CSV table of C-alpha atoms in Angstrom, one decimal:
chain,number,residue,atom,x,y,z
A,1,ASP,CA,23.0,20.6,-16.8
A,2,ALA,CA,22.4,16.9,-15.9
A,3,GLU,CA,18.7,15.8,-16.3
A,4,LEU,CA,17.7,12.9,-13.9
A,5,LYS,CA,14.4,11.1,-14.7
A,6,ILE,CA,12.5,9.6,-11.7
A,7,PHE,CA,9.6,7.1,-12.2
A,8,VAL,CA,7.2,8.1,-9.4
A,9,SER,CA,4.5,5.9,-7.5
A,10,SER,CA,1.4,8.2,-8.3
A,11,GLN,CA,0.1,10.5,-11.0
A,12,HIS,CA,-1.8,12.4,-8.1
A,13,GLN,CA,-0.5,15.6,-6.4
A,14,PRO,CA,2.0,16.7,-9.2
A,15,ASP,CA,2.5,20.1,-7.4
A,16,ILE,CA,3.8,18.2,-4.2
A,17,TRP,CA,6.3,15.9,-6.2
A,18,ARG,CA,7.5,19.1,-8.1
A,19,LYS,CA,7.7,21.1,-4.8
A,20,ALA,CA,10.0,18.4,-3.4
A,21,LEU,CA,12.3,18.1,-6.4
A,22,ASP,CA,12.4,21.9,-6.9
A,23,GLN,CA,14.0,21.9,-3.3
A,24,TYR,CA,16.8,19.3,-4.6
A,25,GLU,CA,17.5,21.4,-7.7
A,26,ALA,CA,17.9,24.6,-5.6
A,27,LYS,CA,20.4,22.9,-3.4
A,28,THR,CA,22.1,21.1,-6.3
A,29,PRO,CA,23.6,23.4,-9.2
A,30,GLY,CA,24.1,21.7,-12.6
A,31,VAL,CA,21.1,19.2,-11.8
A,32,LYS,CA,17.4,19.0,-13.0
A,33,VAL,CA,15.0,16.3,-12.1
A,34,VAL,CA,11.9,15.3,-14.2
A,35,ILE,CA,9.0,13.1,-13.3
A,36,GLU,CA,7.8,10.1,-15.4
A,37,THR,CA,4.5,8.4,-14.4
A,38,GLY,CA,2.8,5.1,-15.4
A,39,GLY,CA,-0.3,3.6,-13.6
A,40,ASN,CA,-1.7,4.7,-10.1
A,41,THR,CA,-1.7,1.0,-9.1
A,42,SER,CA,1.5,-1.0,-8.4
A,43,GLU,CA,0.9,-3.8,-11.0
A,44,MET,CA,0.3,-1.4,-13.9
A,45,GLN,CA,3.6,0.3,-13.0
A,46,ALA,CA,5.2,-3.3,-12.7
A,47,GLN,CA,4.1,-4.1,-16.4
A,48,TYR,CA,5.6,-0.7,-17.5
A,49,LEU,CA,9.0,-1.1,-15.7
A,50,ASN,CA,9.1,-4.9,-16.7
A,51,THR,CA,9.0,-3.6,-20.3
A,52,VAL,CA,11.6,-0.7,-20.1
A,53,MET,CA,14.1,-2.6,-17.8
A,54,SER,CA,13.8,-5.7,-20.1
A,55,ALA,CA,14.9,-3.4,-23.0
A,56,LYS,CA,17.8,-2.0,-20.9
A,57,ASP,CA,16.2,1.4,-21.4
A,58,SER,CA,18.7,4.1,-20.0
A,59,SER,CA,15.9,6.8,-19.9
A,60,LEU,CA,15.0,6.2,-16.1
A,61,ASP,CA,17.6,7.2,-13.4
A,62,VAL,CA,15.6,6.6,-10.1
A,63,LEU,CA,12.6,4.1,-9.9
A,64,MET,CA,10.1,4.3,-7.1
A,65,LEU,CA,9.4,0.6,-6.3
A,66,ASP,CA,6.6,-1.0,-4.1
A,67,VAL,CA,8.0,-2.8,-1.0
A,68,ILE,CA,7.3,-6.2,-2.9
A,69,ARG,CA,9.6,-5.4,-5.9
A,70,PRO,CA,13.3,-5.7,-4.3
A,71,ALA,CA,13.4,-9.5,-4.9
A,72,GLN,CA,12.7,-9.4,-8.6
A,73,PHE,CA,14.9,-6.1,-9.1
A,74,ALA,CA,18.0,-7.6,-7.4
A,75,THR,CA,17.8,-11.1,-9.1
A,76,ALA,CA,17.1,-9.5,-12.6
A,77,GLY,CA,20.1,-7.0,-11.9
A,78,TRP,CA,17.8,-4.0,-12.6
A,79,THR,CA,19.1,-1.9,-9.7
A,80,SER,CA,22.5,-0.6,-8.6
A,81,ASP,CA,23.4,-1.8,-5.1
A,82,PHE,CA,24.1,0.7,-2.3
A,83,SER,CA,27.7,-0.5,-1.5
A,84,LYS,CA,25.5,0.9,3.1
A,85,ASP,CA,23.8,0.9,6.7
A,86,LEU,CA,20.0,0.9,6.6
A,87,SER,CA,20.0,1.2,10.6
A,88,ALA,CA,18.7,4.7,10.4
A,89,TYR,CA,15.3,3.2,8.9
A,90,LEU,CA,12.6,0.9,10.4
A,91,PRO,CA,14.3,-2.6,10.4
A,92,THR,CA,11.2,-4.1,8.6
A,93,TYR,CA,12.1,-1.8,5.7
A,94,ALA,CA,16.0,-2.4,6.1
A,95,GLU,CA,15.0,-6.2,5.7
A,96,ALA,CA,12.7,-5.5,2.8
A,97,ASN,CA,15.4,-3.6,0.8
A,98,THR,CA,18.1,-6.2,1.6
A,99,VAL,CA,18.2,-9.2,-0.9
A,100,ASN,CA,21.0,-11.8,-0.5
A,101,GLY,CA,22.8,-9.2,1.7
A,102,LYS,CA,22.8,-6.6,-1.2
A,103,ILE,CA,21.1,-3.1,-0.4
A,104,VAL,CA,18.8,-3.0,-3.6
A,105,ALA,CA,17.2,0.6,-2.9
A,106,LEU,CA,16.8,3.1,0.0
A,107,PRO,CA,13.4,3.3,1.9
A,108,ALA,CA,11.2,6.1,0.4
A,109,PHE,CA,8.2,5.8,2.8
A,110,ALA,CA,6.3,3.3,5.0
A,111,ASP,CA,2.7,2.2,4.6
A,112,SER,CA,0.1,-0.2,6.1
A,113,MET,CA,-3.7,-0.6,5.8
A,114,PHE,CA,-5.9,1.1,8.5
A,115,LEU,CA,-9.6,1.1,9.1
A,116,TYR,CA,-10.9,4.6,8.2
A,117,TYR,CA,-14.3,5.2,10.0
A,118,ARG,CA,-16.8,8.1,10.0
A,119,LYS,CA,-16.4,9.0,13.8
A,120,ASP,CA,-19.4,11.4,13.4
A,121,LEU,CA,-21.7,8.4,12.5
A,122,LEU,CA,-20.0,6.1,15.2
A,123,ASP,CA,-20.5,8.9,17.9
A,124,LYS,CA,-24.1,9.6,16.8
A,125,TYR,CA,-25.0,5.9,17.4
A,126,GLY,CA,-22.5,5.5,20.5
A,127,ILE,CA,-20.5,2.7,18.6
A,128,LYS,CA,-16.9,1.9,19.6
A,129,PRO,CA,-14.6,1.2,16.5
A,130,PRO,CA,-15.0,-2.6,15.7
A,131,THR,CA,-12.0,-4.9,16.6
A,132,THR,CA,-13.5,-7.9,14.6
A,133,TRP,CA,-15.2,-8.2,11.1
A,134,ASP,CA,-18.3,-9.4,13.0
A,135,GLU,CA,-18.3,-6.3,15.2
A,136,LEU,CA,-17.9,-4.3,11.9
A,137,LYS,CA,-21.0,-5.9,10.3
A,138,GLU,CA,-23.1,-5.2,13.5
A,139,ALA,CA,-21.8,-1.6,13.6
A,140,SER,CA,-22.6,-1.2,9.8
A,141,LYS,CA,-26.2,-2.6,10.2
A,142,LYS,CA,-26.9,-0.3,13.2
A,143,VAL,CA,-25.5,2.9,11.4
A,144,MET,CA,-27.1,2.1,8.0
A,145,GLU,CA,-30.5,1.2,9.5
A,146,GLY,CA,-30.7,4.6,11.4
A,147,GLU,CA,-29.4,6.8,8.5
A,148,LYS,CA,-31.8,5.2,6.0
A,149,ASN,CA,-29.4,6.7,3.4
A,150,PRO,CA,-29.5,4.6,0.2
A,151,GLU,CA,-25.9,5.8,-0.9
A,152,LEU,CA,-24.3,4.9,2.5
A,153,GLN,CA,-21.9,1.8,2.1
A,154,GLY,CA,-21.0,0.0,5.3
A,155,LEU,CA,-17.5,-1.1,4.1
A,156,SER,CA,-15.3,-0.2,1.1
A,157,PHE,CA,-12.3,-2.5,0.3
A,158,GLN,CA,-10.4,-3.3,-2.9
A,159,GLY,CA,-11.9,-6.1,-4.9
A,160,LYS,CA,-10.6,-4.9,-8.3
A,161,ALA,CA,-7.9,-7.1,-9.9
A,162,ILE,CA,-5.2,-4.8,-8.6
A,163,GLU,CA,-2.1,-5.3,-6.2
A,164,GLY,CA,-4.4,-4.0,-3.4
A,165,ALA,CA,-6.6,-7.1,-3.7
A,166,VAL,CA,-3.6,-9.3,-2.7
A,167,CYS,CA,-3.7,-7.3,0.5
A,168,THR,CA,-7.4,-7.7,0.8
A,169,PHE,CA,-7.1,-11.5,0.5
A,170,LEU,CA,-4.2,-11.9,3.1
A,171,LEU,CA,-5.9,-9.7,5.9
A,172,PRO,CA,-8.2,-12.5,7.2
A,173,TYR,CA,-5.7,-15.3,6.3
A,174,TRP,CA,-3.0,-13.5,8.5
A,175,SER,CA,-5.6,-12.7,11.2
A,176,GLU,CA,-6.2,-16.5,11.7
A,177,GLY,CA,-2.4,-16.7,12.4
A,178,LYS,CA,-1.6,-18.4,9.0
A,179,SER,CA,1.6,-17.7,6.9
A,180,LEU,CA,1.9,-18.1,3.1
A,181,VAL,CA,5.6,-19.1,3.1
A,182,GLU,CA,7.5,-21.4,5.7
A,183,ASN,CA,11.1,-22.6,5.1
A,184,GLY,CA,11.3,-20.9,1.5
A,185,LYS,CA,8.3,-22.8,0.0
A,186,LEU,CA,4.5,-22.2,-0.1
A,187,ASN,CA,2.6,-23.1,3.1
A,188,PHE,CA,-1.1,-22.8,2.1
A,189,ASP,CA,-4.0,-23.2,4.5
A,190,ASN,CA,-7.1,-24.0,2.4
A,191,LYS,CA,-9.7,-23.5,5.2
A,192,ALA,CA,-8.1,-20.1,6.0
A,193,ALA,CA,-7.9,-19.2,2.2
A,194,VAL,CA,-11.6,-20.3,1.5
A,195,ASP,CA,-12.7,-18.3,4.7
A,196,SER,CA,-10.9,-15.1,3.5
A,197,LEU,CA,-12.7,-15.2,0.1
A,198,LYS,CA,-16.0,-16.3,1.9
A,199,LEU,CA,-15.7,-13.2,4.2
A,200,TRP,CA,-15.2,-10.7,1.5
A,201,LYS,CA,-18.1,-12.2,-0.5
A,202,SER,CA,-20.4,-12.1,2.7
A,203,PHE,CA,-20.0,-8.3,2.9
A,204,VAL,CA,-21.5,-8.1,-0.6
A,205,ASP,CA,-24.2,-10.8,0.0
A,206,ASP,CA,-25.2,-9.0,3.3
A,207,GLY,CA,-25.4,-5.6,1.5
A,208,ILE,CA,-22.6,-4.2,3.9
A,209,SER,CA,-20.5,-3.7,0.8
A,210,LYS,CA,-22.0,-2.6,-2.7
A,211,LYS,CA,-22.8,-5.2,-5.4
A,212,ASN,CA,-19.9,-4.0,-7.6
A,213,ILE,CA,-17.0,-4.0,-5.0
A,214,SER,CA,-15.1,-6.2,-7.6
A,215,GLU,CA,-14.7,-2.8,-9.5
A,216,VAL,CA,-13.3,-0.9,-6.5
A,217,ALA,CA,-9.6,0.1,-6.7
A,218,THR,CA,-7.6,1.9,-3.8
A,219,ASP,CA,-8.5,5.4,-4.9
A,220,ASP,CA,-12.2,4.4,-5.6
A,221,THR,CA,-12.4,3.6,-1.8
A,222,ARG,CA,-10.7,6.9,-1.0
A,223,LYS,CA,-13.0,9.0,-3.3
A,224,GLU,CA,-16.2,7.4,-2.1
A,225,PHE,CA,-15.2,7.8,1.6
A,226,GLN,CA,-14.0,11.4,0.9
A,227,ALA,CA,-17.4,12.1,-0.9
A,228,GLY,CA,-19.1,11.0,2.5
A,229,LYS,CA,-20.7,7.8,1.1
A,230,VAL,CA,-18.7,5.1,3.2
A,231,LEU,CA,-18.9,4.2,6.9
A,232,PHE,CA,-15.7,2.0,7.1
A,233,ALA,CA,-12.9,2.1,4.5
A,234,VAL,CA,-9.7,-0.2,4.2
A,235,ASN,CA,-7.0,2.1,2.9
A,236,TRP,CA,-3.4,3.3,3.2
A,237,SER,CA,-2.0,6.4,5.0
A,238,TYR,CA,-1.9,8.8,1.9
A,239,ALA,CA,-5.9,9.0,2.0
A,240,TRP,CA,-5.8,11.1,5.2
A,241,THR,CA,-4.7,14.3,3.5
A,242,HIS,CA,-7.4,14.0,0.8
A,243,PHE,CA,-10.1,13.6,3.6
A,244,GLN,CA,-8.8,16.6,5.5
A,245,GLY,CA,-8.2,18.6,2.2
A,246,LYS,CA,-10.1,21.2,0.2
A,247,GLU,CA,-12.4,18.9,-1.9
A,248,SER,CA,-13.7,16.6,0.9
A,249,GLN,CA,-17.0,16.0,2.8
A,250,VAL,CA,-15.5,14.3,5.8
A,251,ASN,CA,-13.1,17.0,7.2
A,252,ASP,CA,-13.0,16.5,11.1
A,253,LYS,CA,-15.3,13.4,10.6
A,254,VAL,CA,-12.5,10.7,10.3
A,255,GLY,CA,-11.0,8.3,12.9
A,256,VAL,CA,-8.3,5.7,12.2
A,257,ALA,CA,-8.1,2.3,13.8
A,258,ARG,CA,-6.3,-1.0,13.3
A,259,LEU,CA,-8.0,-3.3,10.9
A,260,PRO,CA,-10.5,-5.8,12.6
A,261,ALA,CA,-9.5,-9.4,13.2
A,262,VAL,CA,-11.4,-12.5,12.2
A,263,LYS,CA,-13.2,-13.3,15.4
A,264,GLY,CA,-10.6,-15.0,17.8
A,265,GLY,CA,-7.7,-13.9,15.5
A,266,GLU,CA,-5.1,-11.1,15.4
A,267,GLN,CA,-5.6,-7.5,14.4
A,268,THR,CA,-2.9,-7.8,11.5
A,269,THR,CA,-2.4,-5.5,8.6
A,270,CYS,CA,-0.4,-5.6,5.1
A,271,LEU,CA,3.1,-4.1,5.1
A,272,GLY,CA,3.1,-1.4,2.2
A,273,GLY,CA,5.5,1.4,1.3
A,274,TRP,CA,8.0,2.3,-1.5
A,275,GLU,CA,11.7,2.6,-2.0
A,276,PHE,CA,14.1,4.5,-4.3
A,277,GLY,CA,16.0,2.2,-6.7
A,278,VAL,CA,18.8,3.6,-8.9
A,279,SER,CA,18.4,2.0,-12.4
A,280,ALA,CA,21.3,-0.4,-13.4
A,281,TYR,CA,21.0,1.1,-16.9
A,282,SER,CA,21.2,4.9,-15.8
A,283,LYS,CA,24.1,6.7,-17.5
A,284,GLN,CA,24.1,8.9,-14.4
A,285,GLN,CA,24.8,6.5,-11.6
A,286,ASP,CA,26.4,8.9,-9.1
A,287,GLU,CA,23.9,11.8,-9.5
A,288,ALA,CA,21.0,9.3,-9.3
A,289,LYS,CA,22.6,7.9,-6.0
A,290,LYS,CA,23.0,11.5,-4.7
A,291,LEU,CA,19.3,12.2,-5.4
A,292,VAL,CA,18.2,9.0,-3.7
A,293,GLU,CA,20.3,9.9,-0.6
A,294,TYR,CA,18.5,13.3,-0.4
A,295,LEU,CA,14.9,11.8,-1.1
A,296,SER,CA,15.7,9.0,1.6
A,297,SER,CA,16.9,11.6,4.2
A,298,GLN,CA,15.1,12.4,7.5
A,299,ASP,CA,14.0,16.0,6.1
A,300,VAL,CA,12.2,14.5,3.0
A,301,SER,CA,10.6,11.7,5.2
A,302,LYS,CA,9.3,14.5,7.5
A,303,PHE,CA,8.2,16.4,4.3
A,304,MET,CA,6.4,13.4,3.0
A,305,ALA,CA,4.5,12.9,6.3
A,306,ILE,CA,3.4,16.6,6.7
A,307,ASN,CA,2.4,17.1,3.1
A,308,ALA,CA,0.9,13.8,1.8
A,309,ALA,CA,0.5,11.8,5.1
A,310,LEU,CA,3.1,9.1,4.0
A,311,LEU,CA,4.1,7.1,7.2
A,312,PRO,CA,7.9,7.7,8.0
A,313,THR,CA,10.8,5.3,7.4
A,314,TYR,CA,12.4,7.0,10.5
A,315,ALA,CA,11.1,6.0,14.0
A,316,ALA,CA,12.0,9.5,15.6
A,317,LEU,CA,9.5,11.1,13.0
A,318,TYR,CA,6.4,9.3,14.6
A,319,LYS,CA,7.2,11.4,17.7
A,320,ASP,CA,7.9,14.7,15.8
A,321,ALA,CA,5.6,17.5,17.1
A,322,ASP,CA,5.1,19.1,13.6
A,323,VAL,CA,4.2,15.5,12.2
A,324,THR,CA,1.9,14.6,15.2
A,325,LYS,CA,0.3,18.1,15.0
A,326,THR,CA,-0.5,17.6,11.3
A,327,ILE,CA,-1.6,13.8,11.6
A,328,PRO,CA,-2.3,13.1,15.4
A,329,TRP,CA,-2.8,9.4,14.8
A,330,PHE,CA,0.9,9.0,13.4
A,331,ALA,CA,1.9,9.3,17.2
A,332,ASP,CA,0.5,5.7,17.8
A,333,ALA,CA,1.1,4.2,14.2
A,334,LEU,CA,4.7,2.9,14.6
A,335,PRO,CA,3.7,-0.5,16.3
A,336,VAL,CA,1.2,-1.1,13.4
A,337,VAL,CA,3.9,-0.6,10.8
A,338,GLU,CA,6.6,-2.6,12.7
A,339,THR,CA,4.2,-5.6,13.1
A,340,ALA,CA,2.5,-5.3,9.7
A,341,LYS,CA,2.9,-8.6,7.8
A,342,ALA,CA,4.9,-8.8,4.5
A,343,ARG,CA,3.4,-10.2,1.2
A,344,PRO,CA,5.8,-13.0,-0.1
A,345,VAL,CA,9.4,-12.0,-0.8
A,346,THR,CA,10.0,-13.6,-4.3
A,347,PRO,CA,11.5,-12.8,-7.8
A,348,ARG,CA,8.3,-14.1,-9.3
A,349,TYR,CA,6.0,-11.8,-7.2
A,350,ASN,CA,4.2,-10.6,-10.4
A,351,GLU,CA,2.8,-14.2,-11.0
A,352,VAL,CA,2.0,-14.4,-7.2
A,353,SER,CA,0.1,-11.0,-7.4
A,354,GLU,CA,-1.8,-12.1,-10.8
A,355,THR,CA,-3.0,-15.4,-9.1
A,356,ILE,CA,-4.2,-13.9,-5.7
A,357,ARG,CA,-5.8,-10.6,-7.1
A,358,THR,CA,-7.7,-12.4,-10.1
A,359,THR,CA,-9.0,-15.0,-7.6
A,360,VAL,CA,-10.2,-12.2,-5.2
A,361,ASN,CA,-11.8,-10.3,-8.2
A,362,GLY,CA,-13.5,-13.4,-9.9
A,363,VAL,CA,-14.9,-14.5,-6.5
A,364,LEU,CA,-16.3,-11.0,-5.8
A,365,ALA,CA,-17.6,-10.8,-9.6
A,366,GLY,CA,-19.4,-14.2,-9.0
A,367,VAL,CA,-17.2,-15.9,-11.7
A,368,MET,CA,-16.1,-18.7,-9.2
A,369,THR,CA,-16.9,-20.0,-5.7
A,370,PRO,CA,-14.6,-19.3,-2.7
A,371,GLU,CA,-13.8,-23.2,-2.7
A,372,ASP,CA,-13.0,-23.1,-6.5
A,373,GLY,CA,-10.9,-19.8,-5.9
A,374,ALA,CA,-8.7,-21.3,-3.1
A,375,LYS,CA,-8.0,-24.5,-5.2
A,376,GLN,CA,-7.0,-22.5,-8.3
A,377,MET,CA,-4.9,-20.1,-6.1
A,378,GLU,CA,-3.2,-23.0,-4.2
A,379,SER,CA,-2.5,-24.8,-7.6
A,380,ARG,CA,-0.6,-21.8,-9.2
A,381,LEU,CA,1.2,-20.7,-6.0
A,382,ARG,CA,2.7,-24.3,-5.7
A,383,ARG,CA,4.4,-23.8,-9.2
A,384,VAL,CA,5.5,-20.2,-8.4
A,385,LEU,CA,6.7,-20.3,-4.7
A,386,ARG,CA,8.6,-23.6,-5.3
A,387,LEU,CA,12.1,-24.4,-4.0
A,388,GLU,CA,14.9,-23.8,-6.8
A,389,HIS,CA,18.0,-26.0,-7.0
A,390,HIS,CA,20.4,-23.1,-6.3
């Protein structure tokens, strides 16, 4: 029996990972798949994979990689190219998994940030979902003033020094119609960067967000909203199944909307999602490729959507009656994914992540001013997102 080892994107829901791989094994005699986990956050996984891949570790066959990894993994030679038409998938994901024309990995699932909201609380007060951060602050004040609930947070977002905080930083910067990369080099708008960091701080200063939002990771936001302690929550699509699941206080109480804009700006969101890479160092190239073909297939995409609310990589699945029955808001989510904005495509993404996320966190922790943060950020990004000779 061949034993394939897949490094997966989450420790959570082990029974659903296993369920999916048990299906492969049943179809595929002579083949077992085991699960290896690291962190539950993309940069803790990156530290882990950097180490094993740097050592040419042959242990891992298939790697689940965040949509920001392909540039590093292709240039470092850590994946085996699919030698392959990505036209079955959303083009934004075909583009993400193509690097200098090499197919680096097959799309696993789509993701973007949405505004989760307690529609029970919005309906009670007759509030429409906010389309700008200013409307979100006015909505928060109105709901929290009437509830007189000391545990009710207006807005949960990710201020912990995690990959997610890179997403946090870029939301307002993108909304103001700015871009971080123009003609292969850093294009940095300081006013727009200062204003992003200023906006996230003002939520804390106003008491719309809790004093320790610099301690809040992706799954913190999810748990606190699930526990019924949050009005408005920036998060990804996976959180929907937890909120409608067995250990939740918000079953039937959750609406989903596009993220608000900065007043006068665009309702932009962060492109997320994950792909399946075959390790360059795998002793089992062909079996690993066959697993990835399966896990990347329309059936598994559909499985991911119905079982864990992971947004499909196949357009037709946003109009699938079973999918739309289970997650009605998926019926309208394709335009959000297909216009979601990409974090920089760069082999040195890890240094880009480190600079942005530690600035967001330090500003939210009161270690540095928005102004200082932007200057520090701009300085390190100039060295990291430079032009190379060849």
